[PDB]
């Protein structure tokens with residue numbers, strides 16, 4: 001399989017329920033593109049296409065679920081293989097009501113690859129609870145991934161302002177004006193996140 | 198006590214310590230054993246501690262997310278046998294997924310190709326995937342009762358030739374109403390296939 | 392294959408030239424023991440046994456080569472998957488004359504897993520040329536044989552970088568003292584010491 | 586010119602930058618292309634720069650170790666097919682291993698189960714392993730000439746049913762003396778093996 005066909009190959013393996021084949025195709029991508037590269041060039045395009053195919057009525061919700069669950073497992077595997085250094089953690093989650101978690105996982109992964117102790121909480125964390133954990137662990141930052149815009153629109157002005165000494169917001173659902181309204185620093189690029197600390 | 202030590206390591210954000218304690222459990226008890234003796238008691242205690250106001254939601258999230266990662270690793274270690282799959286998920290509105298993962302694990306350990314979908318699958322979509330994969334069975338984990346109560350009579354009937362329902366949120370009467378076979382314990386689930 | 396049989400399984404796979412089987416068994420070990428664990432419980436015992444079988448005349452050099460080369464590849468894979476943080480590097484190598492490199496790779500791996508920017512140079516680096524300017528906060532050396540250390544004059548390791556660590560089967564506290572390095576018994580204690 | 590950028594990143598100890606430049610090369614040139622356009626020219630230049638005293642041994646080590654790791658990844662990506670293996674190594678006393686790895690890589694790309702042993706294998710031990718595994722061939726990379734000169738006439742002839750020799754340290758006359766089939770080009774290796782000796 002040529003690299004430019006890995007995405008279709010992987011989606012086709014998943015849609016036939018061939019998890020073993022899908023795992024082999026993902027590892028090929030990992031070896032060809034490298035860790036960050038396989039996420040950019042294989043995991044993300046496949047998930048985007050799964051969303052588009054669902055939207056057009058070509059696949060159902062259970063096919064997306066199968067694929068997303070598989071790809072989340074592949075990223076979790078990579079995350080655990082990255083280093084987890086000592087020192088004040090960075091808490092990584094999604095806003096209340098945001099159930100798309102893979103962006104947050106990606107952010108945690110990019111941070112850990114640069115030696116940052118990113119604690120991935122899972123998605124959908126109430127802000128008082130997030131603030132309390134950050135305070136208790138002496139967390140240097142909180143990072144939020146917003147895939148949809150609506151969970152941010154549901155938050156009052158300044159809702160993110162005091163969660164931790166630094167609060168970063170990114171993802172397709174976020175922009176600079178909404179970050180400003182909510183009292184977070186907007187970050188477009190996962191690359192720029194490690195630098196900013 | 199490994200369970201208390203694991204929860205304490207998680208609550209300090211000591212992922213390295215937590216992973217070391219989990220691996221000790223795994224080496225001592227083995228795969229099935231670590232679930233029964235460590236993973237499940239910790240999750241139960243996390244729930245109880247949250248309910249009593251002793252821990253917050255972010256602490257439960259960290260612990261649950263960690264343990265889900267460990268169980269996913271055990272799912273991959275059990276392997277995914279060949280042949281017509283058994284689809285495993287949770288009812289629409291059920292966001293507790295670890296029960297479903299557990300069921301998939303126990304089935305895989307008995308050589309059954311349990312394909313874990315993730316949680317919260319609309320029934321028409323689940324039916325369609327079962328049909329497209331020629332799935333011999335569907336298995337649902339219900340942790341809460343409310344998602345089952347929201348479903349129409351007979352809604353689980355014929356998702357596949359065999360449809361199994363278990364978890365704390367399920368009981369025999371609700372399974373009957375919904376057209377599923379009720380399974381009390383994971384032990385009975387593997388048997389009901391083999 | 393059960394965890395207790397992974398070591399003999401892996402060695403058997405390697406000795407029959409079954410690299411695909413060997414890779415699968417190594418990954419099983421990785422998933423069961425975790426990254427540091429698979430190195431301690433699978434890579435190291437297999438390599439020890441390879442050495443013992445060679446020394447007793449039971450296997451030839453080509454068989455050891457095959458196994459060592461494979462296991463070095465597996466560790467390099469894990470090393471590249473670990474984070475490589477910014478900041479002043481720690482250079483990792485072996486003394487002049489020391490061609491056993493896997494200990495050094497292990498040291499670099501343990502450091503990277505704790506967020507230390509361990510630059511693995513490969514083995515067998517002339518003490519002068521190791522004067523790599525890059526602002527290295529430390530140098531770490533793995534000694535497998537004792538003879539390459541014995542060949543060095545007193546204090547030969549003293550000022551390679553602000554801190555100089557020495558460990559491995561070929562090193563002890565007295566030899567580290569004579570050469571002017573800090574002795575480290577455990578890979579675990581290496582990251583802490585920084 | 587990716588080559589100069591890669592070498593400069595490595596000499597700064599910027600592993601992340603070096604890996605990013607290597608991956609760009611992979612995406613532009615593909616697997617065989619990145620070897621020809623990036624890995625090989627960089628190693629050659631590292632050798633020349635050391636020989637002239639421009640870089641030290643630690644710098645060469647850093648670069649060689651990095652590129653060996655990248656090639657090992659490509660070996661695994663090419664896959665290891667089933668069937669009688671081809672053993673790939675270097676002569677006794679030859680510690681340069683990357684040529685052997687290249688040969689294994691080109692064989693695997695053509696579906697040949699090239700089992701890379703690592704470098705520096707005693708001949709009787711190599712012969713014994715080839716015989717025990719029913720290997721169809723042995724392939725040797727000679728970077729230096731001196732390890733070949735040390736060998737007696739015909740030393741390579743019966744290591745396996747077919748024995749191939751190449752690398753900068755080998756030439757046709759030395760291959761003839763040693764009883765190996767000489768190969769210049771890595772691309773021609775799978776072809777040569779698939780056809781009879783003659």
Ligand code: B12
Nearest residue numbers: 047051068098099100101102103145170171172187189190
């Ligand atoms: C899988 C998935 C789901 C799964 C998620 C499973 C899980 N995570 O456990 C589930 C089933 C939960 C789901 C639910 C729904 N989803 Co959905 N789904 C997706 C899908 C297919 C992939 C999601 C994914 O992981 N993408 C990868 C994402 C993270 O990458 P990315 O967004 O391109 O982000 C890049 C950058 O943003 C950056 N980044 C991300 N986070 C951060 C953070 C920081 C700090 C930084 C610096 C950078 C950064 O990283 C990426 C690298 O380029 C997408 C398709 C898509 N185009 O995204 C939809 C999609 C997001 N979903 C969509 C919809 C409509 C829904 C539902 C409303 C459907 C419904 N009716 O129930 C619900 C909403 C639930 C909720 N409240 O959140 C729409 C949203 C469209 C919109 N915004 O209007 C999409 C786009 C599909 C579509 N084409 O219509 N979904």
Ligand code: B12
Nearest residue numbers: 240244261291292293294295296338363364365380382383
């Ligand atoms: C982790 C967790 C969450 C996480 C789950 C994350 C995830 N991705 O899975 C999140 C944050 C999403 C969550 C959300 C909520 N949850 Co919650 N949470 C839990 C917790 C702590 C663990 C869940 C778990 O994994 N259990 C798996 C194991 C531990 O459950 P078990 O009882 O041992 O299951 C056994 C059997 O049922 C069997 N089994 C399970 N499934 C199946 C299937 C078959 C076929 C068979 C044969 C057997 C079988 O296997 C197990 C061992 O035998 C529990 C505590 C608990 N006691 O379960 C609550 C708990 C289930 N949650 C609870 C509540 C109230 C909530 C929320 C309403 C909170 C809120 N206000 O938002 C929401 C509802 C979300 C939803 N719509 O589903 C309550 C429910 C009480 C009730 N029924 O009224 C609990 C019990 C906590 C408590 N003590 O109060 N939760």
Ligand code: B12
Nearest residue numbers: 439442459489490491492493494533558559560575577578
């Ligand atoms: C593979 C191997 C080789 C390979 C190495 C390939 C490569 N690395 O590129 C090659 C073929 C080159 C080789 C050559 C030789 N080797 Co050799 N070989 C081995 C073997 C089988 C495995 C080595 C290995 O990688 N071990 C795995 C590592 C991870 O284990 P460890 O190194 O015990 O490390 C542990 C600790 O020391 C610690 N650690 C290691 N480094 C550091 C550093 C720090 C800072 C810290 C804190 C901890 C630490 O971490 C590890 C986890 O516990 C061993 C057998 C054995 N018992 O070690 C011999 C062995 C070491 N070799 C041996 C010999 C004799 C030779 C040769 C002399 C043989 C020859 N005549 O050619 C040469 C010498 C070459 C030279 N160095 O000059 C003997 C040495 C006996 C002795 N005590 O004197 C051994 C023990 C075999 C035996 N006889 O049983 N060898």
Ligand code: B12
Nearest residue numbers: 628629632636649680681682683684726751752753768770
């Ligand atoms: C890195 C390196 C080392 C490393 C090896 C690391 C490892 N592999 O584990 C180490 C540190 C061991 C090393 C040490 C030494 N080496 Co050195 N180094 C190199 C270097 C830069 C790369 C070697 C390499 O990877 N070659 C692969 C590629 C780059 O070579 P190539 O010419 O493109 O090869 C092509 C063909 O030959 C073909 N090919 C190769 N094998 C085969 C096999 C078959 C069957 C086929 C068909 C084709 C084929 O494929 C390639 C592309 O087409 C070369 C420089 C060079 N080769 O130009 C030297 C070089 C070979 N080393 C040299 C020297 C001087 C030494 C030392 C003697 C230094 C010393 N005093 O210690 C030692 C000797 C070690 C030994 N006993 O072998 C000199 C050799 C001079 C000479 N006498 O001929 C070189 C040429 C450097 C130089 N320019 O001065 N070296």
Ligand SMILES: C[C@H]1O[C@@H](n2cnc3c(N)ncnc32)[C@H](O)[C@@H]1O
Nearest residue numbers: 050051054060061064065317318319
């Ligand atoms: C964005 C993703 O959300 C999933 N999706 C759409 N509707 C639902 C629902 N009711 N329940 C669960 N998941 C849903 C689809 O599979 C889509 O691809």
Ligand SMILES: C[C@H]1O[C@@H](n2cnc3c(N)ncnc32)[C@H](O)[C@@H]1O
Nearest residue numbers: 124125126243244247253254257258
């Ligand atoms: C059952 C689990 O649900 C979690 N939980 C309770 N309330 C919420 C909420 N609003 N958002 C997310 N998770 C919540 C708690 O952590 C509890 O432990």
Ligand SMILES: C[C@H]1O[C@@H](n2cnc3c(N)ncnc32)[C@H](O)[C@@H]1O
Nearest residue numbers: 441442445451452455456705706707
């Ligand atoms: C410690 C390891 O060194 C290897 N070893 C022993 N003698 C040689 C030699 N002449 N050439 C290469 N490797 C050798 C053996 O395979 C042993 O296992």
Ligand SMILES: C[C@H]1O[C@@H](n2cnc3c(N)ncnc32)[C@H](O)[C@@H]1O
Nearest residue numbers: 515516517631632635641642645646
């Ligand atoms: C061919 C390569 O061999 C390396 N080289 C030269 N001398 C030594 C030595 N004493 N020890 C290790 N490597 C050495 C140089 O770095 C050169 O680039």
Ligand SMILES: [Br-]
Nearest residue numbers: 073076266269
């Ligand atoms: Br996961």
Ligand SMILES: [Br-]
Nearest residue numbers: 463464467657
């Ligand atoms: Br390697």
Ligand SMILES: [Br-]
Nearest residue numbers: 616662663694
């Ligand atoms: Br390839």
